[PDB]
């Protein structure tokens, strides 16, 4: 089975010539015969609902059958890498999602994995507190211990020269990528820090911890001084994700709530995303659509939201049979992957026009 | 590094159309707009019907929506234009200036109105109340700006957040003001819970309508009427006029009529509604159509004209009852027409179809036998989306010009789309077709007369003698008497009604009947200039004396013009007015320029002063009633001589003034016409001609000869003619051997008998021949060794099978089923000799193969003495849905020469396919590199060597998501990704290694890429979806590029149009520079010329001065428009369209601006004119 | 047309082409064992004028 994005790109390129934008785009009928009229999400910018990937594609699982903590796409979408509890990276093809290669990367569960803004480096942390450097060809070039306890998430700077790490020691540490030398140590979280995010352009660090008194803190990486404390959630903020527009902070937490904040004005909340029956654990902004994002849950629910809409624009309550750890969007934005605690990773694509959505993830047959 | 942008060809596409009172409230005009271009047309009932251009304006910003309104006691309709992001400009025509006057510009570009969404996807949509009580502009998709109008003409505007409006109006598909309401009622068609086709099984009835009553005074907007269960595929709404009222909502598969009181009425236009809509829809009988992308307008009440996708025209009838309640729909299929983007109803019976995809058509409808029939009355030329452009050598050039050292080139453009797809041949300059050549040294001036329609004599003037050539079946020197051949001649022409001939000499004036001479009265300073128009003939001496001669029945009478000599007359002009613009049947006027710089126009029979300009030579922008001008010509052009034009020669500058009406003084005013014509025995430079190949116009002689043509369309055309160098004298020539041709002297004393080429049309901004293809033109490639054009074309066929992974299932549906369109591709061969397609030279692609790229590539060959061989390469992709692995083919085609088939000369050229094999992935891009074929197959870029009939791979490299465009120069390949920007590659022949030198790390959705060639600097010109031009440089020593791994943005420019094709030509300083040419997707052609640093700095100070101290159309900011992505920038590209405003300024205003910017007008003019001169190709 | 003949560049020497030949701004390859990937063949190493060995950012 295959999800080949090339026909969509070719159709978009042809339509790109004579259509000014989607207002000139000819409508696709909800019929199975209009297969070659589909375009990637970049084509339908006025309708983000196309990228609500509630169509199941493939369940990708390892032979070890162990929980999957982080899934990431190769920056050009050629491959997908999963970080598992066995400290291994499994690579899956971006078109025919088959197993390609496996390697014992870390000695402890892979909790963090991120690619540099330039498509040259993949930084991965693990449960033992080490940080590893990776080449596009999955070659390890450097290894050092950043924290004495588990590192949860790492984020890169726009120029990829500096990166931040969050650990269970309650400290966020800024590092120099070339030197592997820590420059600042950020303190103020009383409990384990579970998520860290670097501002897309500006020099800002947003962090989320288990400390109820200091749930979210904003940092100044160059000076090392905390800028603000955000009393967003009352229970274990799990995710902090700044949108690439540099204005929105997206926070998932154990309090069954996902929240959106304007980092310029943190007095109030822009939006609260209710609809998770259980704890909200994962989240991922859409690469193409600004306001669209997908969130995961501890019961296995995988929901879709858009900024400005009260209720979910879609979702699958039984997407996984376990807590969803990581959500990764394909660079083109037409395939969504989900790493869950149920020892499996699943690929979700856009629903083909003319489908009677009576499958187990949408309805009952 | 530094460069200047110049627009070679203006955009032709049209996107908005309306029929409003542009000039006055006594006549309504067709106001159309495209991308930064606004046109105002008139409807001419005598020509047959033809659209006459009345005005044209350019903006520093693309129009996003256009509308009109009559505000309060106004003499004409105001125009409401919206520009990207949030700008609303209210522009009104200025009768006293013949220009656009800005009434107000409203800015709504605040971060708080954007709600954190940096990427704007909602164009500002301006709507007007039918009653003219307010105007609404939907801003960012969530803010509704209400601009009230007083019933000083405007009221303070307020912004309504549609999200906090009773309900939550999200998305918003369309919004229209409704008829028949006491207060402005705006009907918003929106989608609170958006869905898309594909997720309909879980969400079907998502669209809704809400009618909000806008209270202007109290700023309250309550909801008065609402529906919630409309079909998801609603696309647009149309307010039905007052007698019926309500709203007609267009859905993709259905048509709905909705009103406040009656229950909703809707019908299903096809069987596709079943299972995708729960709305109650009747089955409309006999109709299988789709209303997804359709333009509609109300020709009258209860009847609608709808233009569908595919161009089909339908007449929709609202069948009602005695209570005006719609109960049924009647659909009548009229004749098909052009793919339109806008529609508007002119005077009843006429319907204009604005189009940016093919030529815009003006239609006429008549009731047949209810039903209507449509006929085409006019057609506005539109070189549509320029998907690709090919440069090639014209097939026919004169043997006289064969040895010219500047190459002769033409541009072939893949324009239009679908049924309107075509090939456009574009040439900037006119190339004469020389019949025979005469070498006649010593003749500096010519005149051609009509002997008792055909020209019978050719009068040539020497320094001390005169040559008379009698023209007929043979041209022989006339040595017989009758003509004054013993001295030079000042002027020779036809007097009366082409029955007599008048010949002017410095000694006197004589009347001539053919070879016979009637009488010769001496005239006494020697005569230096004479003007002849009707019996009235005026004579000017060397000292400014003016003498007038009248043809009194026939004999030339003497009449002394009463003129007080305050200042010496330096030049004269006569003009016959046939169109009654010179109001205060034929009437006669004399244009006169004095030494003190005052232009005076007199009524010729009585010599009464009617017009006066206080400071004429300075070149004022607008001439109103009350140095060293060398020549003036006042002529009426257009249909039935409708457009009076004034051409002025002064101090190496050309002044063109377009006469426009403005109310015992002459009720006419002149407006300067922008142009780029450089002027850097009294011989007249301006030669008026009628009927050269059917065209009326004026020829301008000098260093830069030009053709000034104005047809019945009313648009001024200026075509250069420099293939033969400067032209000294010019004359029309109608002969048996030279039918409707012309006649001119080259600067070498040679005389050309030449005619205009027939295959081109000169009624366009560029001489163009548009070849209809009836299918979509994708790529065009020119072959040099065969001198032919290869074109990849696709046509739409109904889809009947669905590939599955390989099996195909036949689409079995109902009879009312709309089959999807399937494209079938073919490669055509076009002969430039006769632009018809070559028979039996057509290659058909496979069933689902799509031509993603087709290029002409030079590859190594041993048979050719040179290294390269120059084939044509094509790359294809089998589009069979996302569920099937896409793979492609490489097609290497050679055009050979064979014996022509009898009776078919074009059959000499035929394809020879050398390579056609299946690739290991989709072939998405192609180019050549040192004789090696470079192909982007899948997510890798390969390099092949063509030997025998098999491609051997040499080197490959991994690349980005999808490489669509790819160009190379000197083993440096520049590859562009669809959304991950550009990458620079290097090929080393010795090691056979393909390596990545640098790439742009930041994401960018690239349209096409080229190179910017300087003396030693190599740039990378990039075009993006945001309509911007970026120049990237490889600067390893720069700090921003960490190790030479980041391409640095060094020049930035926002061209208001998308660019998909590029080409480069050498300069016509400028030692090793190449102009980067590009054709936009809006039908325009632009260039980007590299420039020196000091020249750039001086012209940048000039540009800043022009931006600051000069008012602009619609109040837009030229600097803000050219800023990148505003609707980290490096402003290193200048705006030639803005820099051209210095040429349009008067000599005075130029002097003060040069004083302000601390330089001199002569230096600024030299720089600007050098930029103009080096780019005079095609 | 046929750009290569109407607009010839073979007589033009580009500063960009000089940079790749002389390897301007060739920073030493970091993280010994980086193994690189898309690096070009080192021109200096061909003529035995490459000071960096194994540490060079280009193929040898
Ligand atoms: Zn080296």
**Which pair of structure tokens corresponds to residue B934?**
């470079």
Spatial distance between the Cα atoms of B570 and B424, rounded to a whole number of angstroms: 46
Q: Give the number of residues written for chain B.
A: 1178
Strands (E) in B358-401, as ranges, are: 360-367, 372-380, 388-392
Spatial distance between the Cα atoms of B261 and B1084, rounded to a whole number of angstroms: 50
Contact A186, A219 (CB under 8 A): yes
Contact A69, A88 (CB under 8 A): no
Contact B1057, B1084 (CB under 8 A): yes
Spatial distance between the Cα atoms of B804 and A108, rounded to a whole number of angstroms: 43
Q: Mutate which of A135, A144, A160, A180 to disrupt the C interface (most C C-beta within 10 Å)?
A: A135
Residue B542, CA distances (Å) to A236, B174, B681 in order: 100, 71, 11
Asked whether the CA dihedral B164, B167, B168, B172 is positive or negative, the reply is negative
Number of H-type helices and E-type strands within chain C: 3, 0
User: Residue B663 has what DSSP assignment?
Assistant: -
**Which pair of structure tokens corresponds to residue A3?**
């999800």
Which residues, 6 or more positions from B561, have their beta carbon under 8 angstroms from its beta carbon? B538, B546, B547, B548, B607
Interchain proximity B198–A353, CB inside 8 Å: yes
End-to-end alpha carbon distance in chain A: 22
Q: Which of helix, strand or coil describes residue B577?
A: strand
Strand pairing report for B821-830 and B843-844: antiparallel
Candidates A136, A137, A141; nearest CB to C31: A141
Token pair 């041209």 is found at B475
In angstroms, what separates the C-alpha of B945 from chain C's closest C-alpha? 19
Query: Could you tell me how many CB contacts below 8 A there are between chain A and chain B?
Result: 218
Interchain proximity C16–B972, CB inside 8 Å: yes
Spatial distance between the Cα atoms of A275 and B730, rounded to a whole number of angstroms: 83
User: Which residue range is the domain that position B162 belongs to?
Assistant: 3-380
Token pair 């050292």 is found at B405
Sheet bearing B50-58, strands edge to edge: B16-24, B27-33, B37-44, B50-58
In angstroms, what separates the C-alpha of C47 from chain B's closest C-alpha? 13
CB neighbour burial string for A282-291, b if at least 16 within 10 angstroms, e if fewer: bbbbbbbbbb
Q: In 10 A of CB B161, how many CB atoms?
A: 12
Sheet bearing A79-84, strands edge to edge: A68-73, A79-84, A88-93, A99-104
**Which pair of structure tokens corresponds to residue A141?**
């070039």
Q: Which of helix, strand or coil describes residue B272?
A: helix
DSSP for B512-530?
A: EETTEEEEEEE----EEEE
B90-95: list long-range contacts, CB under 8 Å, 24+ apart. B90/B154, B91/B1113, B91/B1114, B93/B22, B93/B23, B93/B55, B95/B23, B95/B24, B95/B662
Ligand 1 centroid–CA C25 distance in Å is 13
Region at B45 (left for phi over 0; alpha for psi -120 to 50; beta for the rest): alpha
Spatial distance between the Cα atoms of B969 and B825, rounded to a whole number of angstroms: 30
Residues forming a β-bridge with A156: A163
Q: Which of helix, strand or coil describes residue B1121?
A: helix
User: Which residue range is the domain that position C54 belongs to?
Assistant: 1-60
Spatial distance between the Cα atoms of B1057 and B13, rounded to a whole number of angstroms: 11
DSSP for B786-819?
A: S--EEEEEEEEEE--EEEE--EEEE----TT--P
Chains that touch A (3 or more CB pairs under 8 A): B, C
Contact B470, B446 (CB under 8 A): no
Which residues, 6 or more positions from B352, have their beta carbon under 8 angstroms from its beta carbon? B17, B19, B30, B32, B51, B343, B344, B345, B346, B360, B361, B362, B363
Token pair 């002025």 is found at B648
Token pair 């959106």 is found at A260
CB neighbour burial string for A128-144, b if at least 16 within 10 angstroms, e if fewer: bbbbbbbbbebebbbee
**Which pair of structure tokens corresponds to residue B514?**
């053919």
Residue A62: is it exposed, middle or buried by C-beta count within 10 angstroms (0-12/13-18/19+)? middle
Interchain proximity B883–A96, CB inside 8 Å: no
Residues of chain C found within 8 Å of residue B970, distances taken between Cβ atoms: 9-10, 14, 17
Residue B381, CA distances (Å) to A63, B385, B768 in order: 66, 13, 10
Spatial distance between the Cα atoms of B500 and B452, rounded to a whole number of angstroms: 8
C-alpha Rg value of chain A to the nearest Å:
20
Spatial distance between the Cα atoms of B1134 and B1102, rounded to a whole number of angstroms: 10
CA C60, B985, B856: angle at the middle one, nearest 5? 130
| Number of domains, chain C | 1
B595-598: list long-range contacts, CB under 8 Å, 24+ apart. B595/B544, B595/B567, B595/B568, B595/B569, B595/B570, B596/B566, B596/B567, B597/B627, B597/B629, B598/B567
In angstroms, what separates the C-alpha of A135 from chain C's closest C-alpha? 7
Residue B507, CA distances (Å) to B446, B539, B931 in order: 18, 12, 71
Spatial distance between the Cα atoms of B234 and B204, rounded to a whole number of angstroms: 11
- Taking alpha carbons only, the member of B693, B706, B723 closest to residue B409 is B723
DSSP for A60-110?
A: E--SS---EEEEEE-TTSSEEEEEETTSEEEEEESSS--EEEEEE--SS-E
Q: In 10 A of CB A272, how many CB atoms?
A: 11
At B717, give phi and psi (nearest 5°): -115, 135
- Taking alpha carbons only, the member of B401, B104, B28 closest to residue B1114 is B104
Interchain proximity A136–C33, CB inside 8 Å: no
Spatial distance between the Cα atoms of A338 and A296, rounded to a whole number of angstroms: 8
- Taking alpha carbons only, the member of B1087, B1018, B1014 closest to residue B1053 is B1087
- Taking alpha carbons only, the member of B802, B816, B799 closest to residue A352 is B802
- Taking alpha carbons only, the member of B636, B628, B631 closest to residue B647 is B631
Spatial distance between the Cα atoms of B116 and B3, rounded to a whole number of angstroms: 35
C-alpha Rg value of chain B to the nearest Å:
33
**Which pair of structure tokens corresponds to residue A212?**
């109820």
Residues forming a β-bridge with B542: none
Residue B1020, CA distances (Å) to A140, B1, B687, B1009, C24 in order: 34, 10, 45, 7, 19
Contact B745, B729 (CB under 8 A): yes
Residue C39, CA distances (Å) to A120, B1006, B1012 in order: 13, 25, 25
**Which pair of structure tokens corresponds to residue A345?**
């990773």
CB neighbour burial string for B62-73, b if at least 16 within 10 angstroms, e if fewer: bbbbbbbbbbee
Spatial distance between the Cα atoms of A302 and A296, rounded to a whole number of angstroms: 4
Contact B8, B20 (CB under 8 A): no
Query: What does this entry list as its resolution, in Å?
Result: 2.7
- Taking alpha carbons only, the member of B856, B849, B886 closest to residue B871 is B856
Spatial distance between the Cα atoms of A316 and A306, rounded to a whole number of angstroms: 16
CA dihedral B989, B995, B1000, B1001 (to 10 degrees): 180
DSSP for B974-989?
A: EEEESSB-EEEEEEET
CB neighbour burial string for B1072-1099, b if at least 16 within 10 angstroms, e if fewer: bbbbbbbbbbbbbbbbbbbbbeebbebb
**Which pair of structure tokens corresponds to residue B979?**
């959304």
A100-105: list long-range contacts, CB under 8 Å, 24+ apart. A101/A138, A102/A62, A103/A138, A105/A132, A105/A134, A105/A140
Spatial distance between the Cα atoms of B416 and B778, rounded to a whole number of angstroms: 10
Strand pairing report for A79-84 and A88-93: antiparallel
C-alpha Rg value of chain C to the nearest Å:
16
Q: Mutate which of C8, C11, C12, C18 to disrupt the B interface (most B C-beta within 10 Å)?
A: C12
Query: Could you tell me how many CB contacts below 8 A there are between chain B and chain C?
Result: 94
Q: Say which experimental method was used.
A: cryo-EM
Contact B985, B941 (CB under 8 A): yes
At B1103, give phi and psi (nearest 5°): -65, -45
Strand pairing report for B265-268 and B254-258: antiparallel
**Which pair of structure tokens corresponds to residue C55?**
């540490």
Domain with residue B86: its CATH number is 2.130.10.10
What residues flank ion ligand 1 with Cβ within 5 A? C 42, 45, 50, 56, 58
Candidates B782, B986, B1074; nearest CB to C20: B986
Q: Which helix (H) or strand (E) holds B254?
A: strand B254-258
- Taking alpha carbons only, the member of B500, B448, B468, B514 closest to residue B729 is B448
Spatial distance between the Cα atoms of B915 and B935, rounded to a whole number of angstroms: 14
Residue B437: is it exposed, middle or buried by C-beta count within 10 angstroms (0-12/13-18/19+)? middle
Residues of chain B found within 8 Å of residue C11, distances taken between Cβ atoms: 1072
Spatial distance between the Cα atoms of B1083 and B721, rounded to a whole number of angstroms: 23
Chain-centroid distance, C-alpha B1005: 26
Spatial distance between the Cα atoms of A232 and A268, rounded to a whole number of angstroms: 9
In angstroms, what separates the C-alpha of C10 from chain A's closest C-alpha? 33
Which residues, 6 or more positions from B274, have their beta carbon under 8 angstroms from its beta carbon? B268
């Amino acid at each position: 089975k295959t999800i080949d994005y090339n026909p969509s790109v070719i159709k978009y390129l042809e339509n790109r010539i004579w259509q000014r934008d989607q207002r000139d785009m000819r409508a696709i009928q909800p019929d199975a015969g209009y297969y070659n009229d589909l375009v990637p999400p970049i084509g339908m910018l006025n309708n983000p609902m196309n990228a609500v990937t509630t169509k199941f594609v493939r369940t990708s699982t390892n032979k070890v059958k162990c929980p999957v903590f982080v899934v990431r796409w190769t920056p050009e979408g050629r491959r997908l890498v999963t970080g598992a509890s066995s400290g291994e990276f499994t690579l899956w093809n971006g078109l025919t999602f088959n197993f390609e290669t496996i390697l014992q990367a870390h000695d402890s569960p892979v909790r963090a994995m991120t690619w540099s803004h330039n498509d040259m480096w993949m930084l991965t942390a693990d449960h033992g507190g080490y940080v590893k450097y990776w080449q596009s060809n999955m070659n390890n070039v450097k290894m050092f211990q950043a924290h004495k306890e588990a590192i949860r998430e790492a984020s890169f700077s726009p120029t990829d020269n500096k990166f931040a790490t969050c650990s269970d020691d309650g400290t966020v540490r800024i590092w120099d990528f070339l030197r592997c030398h820590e420059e600042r140590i950020l303190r103020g979280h009383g409990a384990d820090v579970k998520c860290v995010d670097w501002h897309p352009t500006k020099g800002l660090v947003v962090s989320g911890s288990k400390d109820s008194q200091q749930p979210i803190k904003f940092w100044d990486p160059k000076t090392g001084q905390s800028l603000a404390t955000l009393h967003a959630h009352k229970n274990t903020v799990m995710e902090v994700k700044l949108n690439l527009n540099g204005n929105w902070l997206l926070t998932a937490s154990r309090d069954h709530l996902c929240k959106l904040f304007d980092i310029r004005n943190l007095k109030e909340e822009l939006q609260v995303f209710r609809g998770h029956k259980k704890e909200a654990t994962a989240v991922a902004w859409h690469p193409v659509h600004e306001g669209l994002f997908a969130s995961g849950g501890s019961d296995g629910s995988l929901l879709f939201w858009h900024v400005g809409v009260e209720k979910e624009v879609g979702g699958m309550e039984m997407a996984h049979e376990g807590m969803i750890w990581s959500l990764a969007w394909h660079p083109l934005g037409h395939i969504l992957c989900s790493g869950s605690n149920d020892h499996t990773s699943k690929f979700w694509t856009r629903n083909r026009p003319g489908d009677k959505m009576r499958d187990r993830y949408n309805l009952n047959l | 590094m530094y460069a200047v942008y110049k627009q070679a060809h203006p955009p032709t596409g049209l996107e908005f159309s309306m029929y409003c009172n542009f000039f006055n409230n006594s006549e309504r005009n067709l106001v159309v707009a495209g991308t930064s271009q606004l046109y105002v047309y008139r409807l001419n009932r005598d020509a047959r019907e033809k659209l006459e251009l009345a005005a044209s304006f350019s903006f520093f910003g693309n129009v996003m929506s256009m509308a009109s309104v009559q505000l309060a006691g106004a003499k004409r309709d105001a125009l409401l234009l919206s520009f990207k992001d949030a700008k609303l400009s209210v522009v009104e025509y200025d009768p006293g200036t013949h220009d656009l006057k800005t009434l107000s510009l409203h800015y709504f570009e605040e971060p708080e109105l954007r709600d954190g969404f940096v990427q704007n996807v909602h164009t500002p949509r301006v709507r007007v109340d039918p009653d003219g009580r307010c105007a609404a502009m939907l801003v960012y998709g969530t803010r509704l700006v209400v601009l009230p109008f007083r019933r000083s003409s405007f009221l303070p505007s307020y912004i309504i957040d549609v999200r906090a409006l009773d309900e939550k109006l999200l998305n918003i598909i369309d919004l229209q003001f409704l008829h028949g309401y006491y207060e402005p009622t705006l009907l918003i068609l929106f989608e609170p819970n958006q869905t898309w086709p594909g997720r309909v099984a879980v969400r079907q009835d998502t669209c809704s309508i809400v009618a909000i009553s806008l209270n202007i005074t109290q700023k309250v907007h309550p909801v008065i009427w609402s529906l919630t269960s409309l079909p998801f595929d609603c696309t647009q709404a149309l307010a039905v006029p007052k007698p019926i009222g309500g709203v007609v909502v267009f859905a993709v598969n259905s048509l709905l009529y909705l009103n406040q009181s009656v229950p909703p009425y809707g019908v299903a236009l096809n069987s596709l509604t079943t299972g995708t809509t729960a709305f109650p829809l009747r089955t409309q009988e006999g109709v299988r159509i789709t209303l997804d992308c359709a333009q509609a307008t109300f020709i009258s009440y209860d009847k609608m004209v709808i233009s569908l996708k595919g161009g089909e025209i339908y007449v929709l009838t609202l069948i009602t009852d005695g209570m005006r309640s719609v109960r049924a729909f009647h659909f009548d299929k009229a004749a098909a027409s052009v793919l339109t983007t806008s529609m508007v109803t002119m005077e009843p019976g006429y319907l204009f179809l604005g189009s940016r995809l093919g030529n815009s058509l003006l239609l006429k409808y008549t009731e047949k036998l209810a039903t209507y029939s449509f006929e085409v009355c006019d057609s506005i030329l539109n070189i549509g989306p320029c998907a690709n452009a090919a440069v090639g050598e014209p097939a026919f050039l004169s043997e006289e010009f064969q040895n010219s050292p500047e190459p002769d080139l033409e541009i072939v453009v893949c324009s239009g789309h679908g049924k309107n797809g075509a090939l456009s041949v574009l040439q900037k300059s006119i190339r004469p077709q020389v019949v025979t050549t005469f070498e006649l040294p010593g003749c500096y001036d010519m005149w051609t007369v009509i002997a008792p329609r055909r020209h019978g004599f050719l009068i040539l003037s020497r320094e001390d003698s005169t040559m008379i050539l009698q023209t007929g079946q043979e041209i022989m020197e006339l040595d017989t008497s009758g003509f004054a051949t013993q001295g030079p001649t000042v002027f020779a022409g036809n007097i009366g009604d082409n029955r007599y001939i008048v010949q002017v000499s410095p000694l006197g004036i004589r009347l001539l009947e053919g070879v016979n001479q009637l009488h010769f009265i001496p005239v006494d300073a020697p005569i230096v200039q004479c003007a002849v128009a009707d019996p009235y003939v005026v004579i000017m001496s060397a000292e400014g004396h003016v003498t007038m001669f009248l043809l009194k029945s026939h004999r030339l009478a003497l009449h002394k013009p009463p003129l007080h000599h305050q200042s010496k007359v330096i030049t004269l002009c006569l003009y016959r007015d046939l169109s009654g613009m010179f109001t205060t049947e034929p009437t006669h006027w004399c244009l006169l320029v004095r030494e003190n710089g005052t232009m005076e126009i007199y009524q010729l029979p009585d010599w009464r002063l009617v017009f006066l300009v206080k400071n004429f030579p300075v070149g004022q922008r607008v001439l109103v009633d009350s140095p060293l001008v060398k020549e003036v010509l006042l002529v009426a052009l257009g249909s039935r001589q409708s457009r009076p034009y004034l051409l002025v020669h002064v101090d190496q500058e050309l002044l063109i003034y377009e006469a426009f009406p403005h109310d015992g003084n002459l009720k006419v005013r002149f407006k300067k016409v922008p142009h780029n014509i450089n002027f850097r025995g009294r011989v007249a430079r301006f030669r008026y001609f009628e009927d050269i190949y059917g065209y009326s116009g004026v020829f301008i002689c000098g260093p830069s000869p030009h053709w000034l043509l104005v047809t019945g369309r009313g648009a001024l055309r200026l075509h250069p003619m420099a293939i033969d160098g400067p032209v000294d004298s010019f004359a029309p020539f109608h002969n048996v051997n030279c039918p409707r041709g012309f006649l001119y002297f080259n600067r070498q004393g040679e005389l050309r008998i030449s005619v205009l080429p027939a295959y081109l049309s000169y009624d366009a901004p560029w001489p163009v021949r548009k070849i209809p293809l009836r299918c979509t033109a994708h790529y065009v490639a020119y072959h040099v060794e065969s001198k032919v054009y290869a074109v990849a074309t696709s046509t739409n066929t109904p889809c009947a099978r669905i590939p599955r992974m390989k099996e195909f299932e036949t689409i079995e549906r109902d009879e009312r089923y709309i089959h999807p369109q399937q494209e079938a591709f073919s490669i055509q061969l076009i002969s430039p000799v006769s632009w018809e397609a070559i028979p039996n030279a057509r290659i058909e692609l496979q069933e689902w193969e799509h031509v993603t790229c087709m290029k002409t590539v030079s590859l190594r060959s041993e048979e050719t003495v040179s290294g390269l061989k120059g084939y044509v390469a094509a790359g294809t992709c089998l589009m069979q849905g996302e569920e099937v692995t896409c793979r492609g083919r490489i097609l290497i085609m050679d055009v050979i020469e064979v014996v022509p088939e009898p009776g078919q000369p074009l059959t000499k050229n035929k394809f020879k396919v050398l390579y056609e094999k299946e690739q290991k992935g989709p072939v998405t891009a192609l180019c050549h590199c040192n004789g090696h074929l470079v192909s982007a197959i899948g997510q890798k870029i390969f390099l092949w060597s063509l030997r025998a009939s098999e491609l051997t791979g040499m080197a490959f490299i991994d690349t980005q998501l999808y490489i669509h465009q790819m160009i190379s120069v000197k083993n440096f390949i520049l590859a562009a990704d669809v959304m991950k920007s550009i990458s620079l590659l290097r090929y080393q022949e010795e090691s056979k290694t393909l390596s990545l030198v640098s790439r742009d790390a930041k994401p960018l959705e690239v349209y096409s890429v080229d190179f910017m060639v300087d003396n030693a600097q190599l740039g990378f010109l990039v075009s993006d979806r945001d309509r911007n031009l970026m120049v990237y440089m490889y600067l390893p020593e720069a700090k921003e590029s960490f190790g030479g791994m980041r391409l640095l943005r060094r020049a930035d420019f926002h061209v208001g149009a998308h660019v998909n094709t590029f080409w480069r030509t050498p300069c016509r300083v400028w030692e090793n520079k190449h102009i980067t040419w590009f054709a936009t997707l809006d039908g325009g052609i632009g260039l980007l010329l590299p420039m020196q640093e000091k020249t750039y700095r001086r012209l940048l100070m000039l540009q800043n001065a022009l931006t600051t101290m000069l008012p602009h159309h619609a109040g837009l900011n030229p600097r803000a428009f050219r800023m990148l992505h505003v609707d980290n920038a490096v402003r290193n590209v200048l705006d030639g369209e803005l820099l051209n405003r210095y040429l349009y300024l008067s000599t005075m205003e130029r002097s003060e601006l040069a004083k302000k910017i601390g330089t001199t007008p002569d230096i600024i003019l030299d720089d600007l004119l050098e930029t103009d001169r080096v780019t005079a190709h095609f | 047309g046929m750009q290569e003949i109407i607009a010839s560049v073979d007589h033009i020497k580009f500063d960009l082409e000089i940079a790749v030949e002389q390897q301007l701004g060739a920073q030493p390859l970091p993280f010994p064992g980086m193994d690189k990937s898309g690096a070009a063949v080192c021109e200096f190493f061909l003529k035995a004028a490459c000071g960096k060995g194994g540490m060079c950012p280009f193929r040898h």
